[PDB]
C-alpha cells in the first residue's frame, strides 16, 4: 500500500500545495508532519515570530481536523526522526516543498539520502516562488540577472507563472491508528510558554493560512487601489490601516501562495488597462521578492560581506555604542526610535520606515555594518526572510544593487512630509504624546518651559540626539565616496 508523508517546513497552507496533492494521491495513510526542534531557544528568535509560526501550525491543525486528519508536530532533528518514522509508518513516498536557502539544501540532501536507504520516493515540487528559479538562470544563459530591469524582461520572456494548484480533497487519508510516534501527547502544537519564552507576544498580526486568505480578500475589496498601486508613494506613517498589504509574514512562512497572489493580480489588471507596471506595481513587489530569491540562491555568501562577489567591501565602523542606541530605540530622533519600537512590538514596518532606520544605521549617520543591522531585524521581524532581509540591507547600505550614496534620508524631515502632527510617533512613543507638533520631530529644540509642560524633558524622560545629522551625514557621504573610488 501507499503511505506518504507531507513534510511542512515552509508552505504552511492547504491551497496551492502540489506536495500535498501528490502525497494524497492513491494514498492509504497520509502523515502531515512538522519537525520542531525543542532546543531552538537554547542555542535569536523573538516570541512574536515564533508564536506566528505556532499560530500558523494551529491553523493547519484545524484544517486537517476538518478533513478527518491531524497535524503531527514531531520533536527532534529531521535526520534523526525520519529514519524511525520511515520504518514505523511503512512510508513509500516523501513530499515537501522545495527550498533554496543554504541550510535547507544541506538538510534536504541528507533527508534524500536517508529516504533512498529506506526505499522512499522523494517528490519536491516548486511552489514557494513564482517560477523555478534555476530555470530562470538557465534561460538567461547560465547567470542570474543583476538588475530589476533585466530581470523583468526575463520573466516577460518566460510568460505567466504556473497557475495555483487546486484544493486538496474534502476528505484526507488519516494517519494509521495506534502508532507510537503519532501519539497525540508528543505531536501536539505547543504554546509559546511551553517552548521557553517568558514574555508574551505583542504583535497584532495573527498567523495561519485562514488569516492570510482573509487579508488577501481585504486587499482586493477595492480593485482600483490594486491596479493603481505604486510602492514609493505609499505612507510609512500609517498604522491604523497600513498603506500596503502586510502579506509579507504570510508569504515568508508560506501561509499564502505567491502564485495565488499573482493570479489574483492578473485578474484585476485584465479589467483595468491603466494599471501600474513593474517595478512599482503590486505585481512588481512580488517580482522584487522573486528577483532577490534568484540572485541570492545562486550567489555564494549572500548574507555576508566577505566572500560575497556582489557586495562591496566597505570598512564599516565597529561602534557598539551607536549600535546599542539604535537597537534599544534611544537615538534621540523620535522618528527613528518609533520605528525601532514598532519593530520590537509589531515585528513589521512599512518599507519606507525600514529605509529610514537602515540608512540611519549604515551609510547615513552611524556608519555601522549592515550585517549588524541585519542581525537585529532577523530577531524581531515576523517576515524575516533570508534572501530579502539581506538584499534590502545591502541596498540601503549602498553595498549592492543600489549605488546613489548621495541620497541620504533626513531623520527629522522624512516623516514630517507624511505626518506633521506626529501621530505615528505618539502611538509608539507615548512619552511624547503631549509634545506640541512644532517640536515633536526635534524635541531638543523645544524651550525648557514647553518640555516641562509636555512632561517630556530631554535628557531625563527622552534621550538627546546621539549625533548631529548635518555633521554625521556629511562625514558618511565623504567616506562612502572614497570607498567607491577605491573599489
449 marked ligand binding residue: no
290 marked ligand binding residue: yes
**Contact status: 245 vs ligand FAD (CB under 6 A):** yes
Shortest Cβ 333–Cl ion spacing (Å): 13
Strand partners, 6: 32, 95
CA 392 to chain centroid: 11
Shortest Cβ 389–ligand FAD spacing (Å): 3
Could you say which residues in the range 274-293 bind ligand FAD, by CB under 6 A? 285-286, 288-289, 292
Could you say which residues in the range 414-433 bind Cl ion, by CB under 5 A? 414
As given in the structure block, the three cell numbers for residue 312 are: 562591496
287 marked ligand binding residue: yes
Strand partners, 329: none
Query: What backbone phi and psi angles, to 5 degrees, belong to 234?
Result: -85, 165
Nearer to Cl ion, 405 or 409 (CB): 409
Which of 252, 257, 265 has its CA nearest to residue 292? 252
Which of 57, 21, 72, 35 has its CA nearest to residue 174? 72
- Which of Cl ion, ligand FAD, none sits in contact with 414, Cβ below 5 to 8 A by type? Cl ion
User: What is the distance between the alpha carbons of residues 91 and 94, in angstroms, rounded to a whole number?
Assistant: 8
Shortest Cβ 160–ligand FAD spacing (Å): 18
Nearer to ligand FAD, 275 or 350 (CB): 350
The DSSP letter of residue 193 is: T
Decide: 291 and 392 in contact? Cβ < 8 Å.
Answer: no
Decide: 429 and 338 in contact? Cβ < 8 Å.
Answer: yes
Could you say which residues in the range 266-305 bind Cl ion, by CB under 5 A? none
Residues touching ligand FAD, count (CB under 6 A)? 28
Decide: 32 and 70 in contact? Cβ < 8 Å.
Answer: yes
445 marked ligand binding residue: no
**Contact status: 410 vs Cl ion (CB under 5 A):** yes
Query: What backbone phi and psi angles, to 5 degrees, belong to 428?
Result: -95, -20
Nearer to ligand FAD, 246 or 454 (CB): 246
Nearer to ligand FAD, 354 or 469 (CB): 354
Distances (CA, A) of 369 to 222, 316, 471: 41, 5, 19
DSSP secondary structure, 133-146, as one string: HHHHHHHTTSS--S
292 marked ligand binding residue: yes
Shortest Cβ 313–ligand FAD spacing (Å): 19
- The label of the residue with cell 506566528 reads 52
- Which of ligand FAD, Cl ion, none sits in contact with 195, Cβ below 5 to 8 A by type? none
**Contact status: 351 vs ligand FAD (CB under 6 A):** yes
Could you say which residues in the range 374-393 bind ligand FAD, by CB under 6 A? 377, 381, 383-385, 388-389, 392-393
Q: Give the total residue count for the chain.
A: 487
DSSP H helices in 165-281: 184-187, 209-219, 223-227, 248-252, 258-271
Shortest Cβ 32–ligand FAD spacing (Å): 25
Q: Would you list which residues are annotated within the binding site?
A: 231, 244-248, 285-292, 348, 351, 354, 383-385, 389, 392
- Return binding residues for FAD: 231, 244-248, 285-292, 348, 351, 354, 383-385, 389, 392
| Interface residue list for ligand FAD (CB under 6 A) | 231, 244-248, 251-252, 285-286, 288-289, 292, 350-351, 354-355, 358, 377, 381, 383-385, 388-389, 392-393, 396
Positions in the binding site for Cl ion (CB under 5 A): 409-410, 413-414
Amino acid at each position: 500500500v501507499k503511505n506518504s508523508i507531507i513534510w511542512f517546513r515552509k508552505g504552511l497552507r492547504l491551497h496551492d500545495n502540489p506536495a500535498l496533492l501528490e502525497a494524497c494521491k492513491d494514498a492509504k495513510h497520509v502523515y502531515p508532519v512538522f519537525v520542531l526542534d525543542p532546543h531552538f531557544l537554547q542555542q535569536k528568535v523573538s516570541v512574536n515570530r515564533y508564536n506566528f509560526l505556532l499560530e500558523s501550525l494551529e491553523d493547519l491543525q484545524r484544517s486537517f481536523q476538518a478533513r478527518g486528519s491531524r497535524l503531527l508536530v514531531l520533536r527532534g532533528k529531521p535526520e534523526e526522526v525520519f529514519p524511525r518514522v520511515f520504518r514505523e509508518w511503512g512510508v513509500t513516498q516523501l513530499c515537501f516543498e522545495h527550498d533554496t536557502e543554504p541550510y535547507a539544501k544541506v538538510r534536504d540532501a541528507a533527508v534524500r539520502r536517508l529516504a533512498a536507504e529506506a526505499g522512499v520516493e522523494v517528490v519536491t515540487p516548486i511552489s514557494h516562488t513564482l517560477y523555478d528559479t534555476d530555470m530562470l538562470v538557465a534561460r538567461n544563459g547560465g547567470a542570474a540577472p543583476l538588475t530589476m530591469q533585466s530581470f523583468t524582461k526575463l520573466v516577460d520572456r518566460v510568460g505567466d507563472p504556473p497557475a495555483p494548484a487546486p484544493d486538496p480533497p474534502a476528505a484526507m487519508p488519516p494517519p494509521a491508528e495506534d502508532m507510537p510516534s503519532a501519539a497525540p501527547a508528543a505531536t501536539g502544537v505547543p504554546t509559546w510558554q511551553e517552548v521557553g519564552f517568558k514574555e508574551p507576544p505583542l504583535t497584532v498580526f495573527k498567523g495561519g493560512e485562514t488569516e492570510a486568505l482573509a487579508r488577501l480578500e481585504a486587499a482586493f475589496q477595492d480593485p482600483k487601489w490594486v491596479a493603481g498601486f505604486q510602492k514609493p508613494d505609499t505612507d510609512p506613517s500609517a498604522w491604523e490601516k497600513p498603506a500596503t498589504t502586510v502579506l509579507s509574514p504570510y508569504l515568508k512562512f508560506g501561509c499564502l501562495s505567491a502564485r495565488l497572489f499573482h493570479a489574483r493580480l492578473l485578474e484585476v489588471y485584465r479589467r483595468h488597462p491603466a494599471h501600474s507596471q513593474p517595478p512599482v506595481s503590486l505585481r512588481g513587489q512580488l517580482l522584487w521578492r522573486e528577483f532577490f530569491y534568484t540572485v541570492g540562491s545562486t550567489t555564494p555568501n549572500f548574507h555576508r560581506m566577505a566572500g560575497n562577489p556582489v557586495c562591496k567591501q566597505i570598512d564599516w565602523d565597529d561602534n557598539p555604542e551607536f549600535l546599542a542606541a539604535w537597537r534599544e530605540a534611544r537615538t534621540g530622533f523620535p522618528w527613528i526610535d518609533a520605528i525601532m519600537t514598532q519593530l520590537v512590538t509589531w515585528g513589521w514596518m512599512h518599507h519606507l520606515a525600514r529605509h529610514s532606520v537602515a540608512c540611519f544605521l549604515t551609510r547615513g549617520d552611524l556608519y555601522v555594518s549592515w550585517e549588524r543591522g541585519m542581525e537585529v531585524f532577523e530577531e524581531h521581524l515576523i517576515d524575516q526572510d533570508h534572501y530579502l532581509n539581506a538584499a534590502n540591507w545591502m541596498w540601503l547600505s549602498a553595498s549592492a544593487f543600489f549605488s546613489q550614496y548621495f541620497r541620504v534620508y533626513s531623520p527629522v524631515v522624512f516623516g514630517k512630509k507624511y505626518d506633521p502632527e506626529g501621530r505615528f510617533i505618539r502611538k509608539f512613543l507615548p512619552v511624547l504624546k503631549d509634545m506640541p507638533a512644532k517640536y515633536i520631530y526635534e524635541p531638543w529644540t523645544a524651550p525648557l518651559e514647553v518640555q516641562r509642560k509636555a512632561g517630556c524633558v530631554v535628557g531625563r524622560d527622552y534621550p538627546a540626539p546621539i549625533v548631529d545629522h548635518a555633521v554625521a551625514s556629511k562625514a558618511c557621504i565623504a567616506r562612502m565616496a572614497a570607498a567607491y573610488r577605491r573599489s
